[PDB]
Design a protein around this nucleic acid. Structure first.
Ligand SMILES: OC[C@H]1O[C@](CO)(O[C@H]2O[C@H](CO)[C@@H](O)[C@H](O)[C@H]2O)[C@@H](O)[C@@H]1O
Ligand SMILES: [Cu+]
Length: 581
DNA sequence: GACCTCCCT
DNA sequence: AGGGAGGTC
């Protein structure tokens, strides 16, 4: 395997600053925030170059070239490079092609997470997987200069070679604008969000942690008093023995490994013995303690008291974002004791406030749009309570005859319809029988014949084309749709049904983010985007901007696309994330 | 290092 | 429907 030719440069030259280049700014640490850049490579019309970061990033011409938006770069995962460079006070501009995002749009099922995996999609194999170069786990390391340098230049050369074929394919798929006008500009916005971060009131979490520690100690002792002995409550072997052998509790669910102690199961066992509610309480508290007190405190930067998440923009199969380290998309809200964690998330400057705007029922509104179901579209045109309306229809009752249990069940059905669910899975959910579940679904489709039609038509389209699409032309390939195995085919069908709804919702909120960022700038507001949680945007702004944000944010979000039904956005603000309710 | 419950939308 | 994050072996 003969080396690829390149200049191991000792200094930056003019021919390295062409107005078109593939660029590699390598950040090997997974978490790129304030992380080292271990090397640089540039491939352009004049050749291939490796530069050492301490050289290139001290060179004013290079830094200016980095920041010049008329000097176009092709990269893989530009957000990583962008953020790492922001921490060093350097702006990266002019990124006109991101191979990671191109690969993700073409097929999110491939799990492209390095240049080698993207290149393999076009039968290009003259580059190694990062894992082969860096190793894995405790053996992970930056290799010596000649090996590192060759690797970065090969990645750059791959990018240079693969841009045209990736773009041609995106174009054939009508995904070219989706890359260039949505995902790439979103990438910059997300880079700013991650860099800005979110301020944490660590003292507040620590005293929450102190309280929890005390309450956990109390319940733990109670559990041991009720069990008549001590044991590792978090050990599935030990607990299963206490519950199902020593205390003779019925076994309602098994798990391949052993006895199920899932919360759905424990709830049914609670009548039999007082230990059960205490174990549940213990789990709720321990979850908060371990994950959202301890876990959060571990990743707060002590110098700024901020958490800086990383939004994985090229992971989920539907076009949603994900968030890591910490995950700021699963902060408790459902139960009050856990929701109080949100009080620890505070504005980053004094006299600023948190502002949260969320779409109201975006998935069902999208479904109404794509199905063209007359009844559902009317329901949203009237701005009805959708679950109450759905109860009225499937039970054939007047609004005044809808009971709370009726509403709750219509709500579960609505979620089921959205997730493409079937008699069995709705059964599990409503704690009812398969045949009953099947009658609900049948009643649903009688009231919403357009949605039935859609569910039928989309599964057939998935079979005929091999994939389904979203509003903005995101794509998901569903080859299991023709499996002769019921369970595998059926999962594929649900995906066929759900992906255009979940994915189109993701598309809309991504566009809103772009539109919003543009409006914020035009208006010269200091308001800034901090977070996205699938159907909601969280910002922080001076107290003096709230009144304008109240009008501006919902409007931008509501007007992002025009559907057959209105989009509706609710909003709140307050001293903390908790209070923005 | 791999494999196997509970938090969010 | 999508995700992220301690015991056992
Ligand atoms: O797609 C964004 C993200 O994906 C990569 C690989 O493409 O994944 C690494 O980085 C993320 C962010 O910390 C980690 O969660 C993941 O485990 C890593 O493999 C990375 O390059 C991008 O930043
Ligand atoms: Cu786990």
């Amino acid at each position: 395997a003969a080396k690829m030719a390149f200049t191991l440069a000792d200094r930056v030259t003019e021919e390295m600053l062409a107005d078109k280049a593939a660029l590699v700014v390598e950040v090997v640490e997974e978490n790129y925030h304030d992380a080292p850049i271990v090397g640089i490579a540039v491939v352009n019309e004049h050749g291939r170059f490796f530069l050492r970061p301490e050289t290139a990033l001290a060179d004013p011409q290079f830094v200016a070239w980095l920041g010049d938006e008329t000097k176009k770069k092709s990269m893989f995962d530009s957000k990583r490079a962008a953020v790492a460079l922001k921490w060093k006070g350097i702006e990266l501009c002019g990124v006109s092609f991101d191979l990671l995002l191109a690969a993700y749009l073409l097929d999110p099922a491939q799990g492209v997470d390095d240049v080698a995996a993207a290149a393999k999609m076009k039968q290009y194999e003259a580059v190694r997987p990062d894992e082969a170069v860096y190793g894995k786990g405790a053996k992970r390391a930056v290799p010596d200069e000649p090996v590192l340098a060759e690797h970065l230049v090969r990645k750059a050369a791959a990018i240079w070679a693969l841009e045209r074929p990736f773009l041609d394919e995106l174009r054939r798929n009508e995904q070219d604008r989706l890359l260039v006008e949505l995902e790439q500009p979103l990438s910059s916005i997300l880079a700013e969000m991650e860099f800005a971060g979110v301020k944490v009131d660590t003292k507040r979490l620590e005293q929450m942690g102190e309280e929890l520690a005390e309450q956990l100690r109390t319940v733990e002792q109670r559990i041991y008093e009720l069990a008549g002995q001590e044991f590792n409550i978090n050990s599935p072997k030990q607990l299963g023995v206490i519950l199902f052998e020593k205390l003779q509790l019925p076994v309602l669910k098994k798990s391949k490994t052993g006895y199920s102690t899932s919360a759905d199961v424990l709830e049914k066992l609670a009548p039999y013995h007082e230990i059960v509610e205490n174990i549940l309480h213990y789990r709720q508290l321990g979850k908060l303690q371990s994950t959202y007190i301890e876990g959060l405190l571990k990743v707060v930067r002590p110098d700024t008291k901020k958490v800086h998440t990383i939004f994985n923009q090229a992971l989920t199969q539907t076009g949603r974002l994900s968030s890591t380290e910490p995950n700021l998309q699963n902060i408790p809200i459902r139960l009050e004791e856990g929701r109080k964690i949100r009080q620890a998330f505070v504005p980053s400057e004094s006299d600023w406030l948190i502002f949260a705007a969320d779409y109201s029922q975006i998935e069902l509104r999208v479904l109404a749009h794509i199905a063209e179901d007359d009844n559902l579209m009317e329901a949203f045109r009237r701005d009805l309570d959708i679950h109450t309306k759905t109860a009225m229809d499937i039970f054939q009752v007047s609004e005044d005859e809808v009971t709370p249990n009726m509403r709750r069940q219509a709500k579960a059905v609505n979620f089921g319809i959205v997730y493409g669910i079937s008699d069995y899975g709705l059964a599990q959910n409503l704690n009812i029988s398969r045949k009953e579940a099947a009658e609900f679904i049948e009643r649903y489709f009688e009231s919403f014949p357009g949605v039935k039609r859609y569910m039928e038509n989309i599964v057939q389209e998935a079979k005929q084309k091999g994939y389904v699409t979203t509003l903005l032309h995101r794509r998901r390939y569903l080859p299991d749709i023709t499996s002769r195995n019921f369970n595998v085919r059926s999962f594929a069908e649900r995906m066929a049904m759900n992906t255009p709804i979940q994915g189109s919702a993701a598309d809309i909120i991504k566009k809103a983010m772009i539109d919003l960022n543009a409006r914020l700038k035009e208006e010269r507001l200091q308001a800034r985007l901090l977070l996205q949680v699938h159907d909601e945007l969280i910002l922080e702004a001076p107290k003096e901007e709230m009144e304008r944000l109240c009008r501006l944010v919902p409007e931008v979000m509501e007007q992002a696309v025009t559907l057959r039904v209105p989009l509706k956005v609710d909003y709140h603000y307050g001293s903390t994330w908790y209070d923005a309710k």
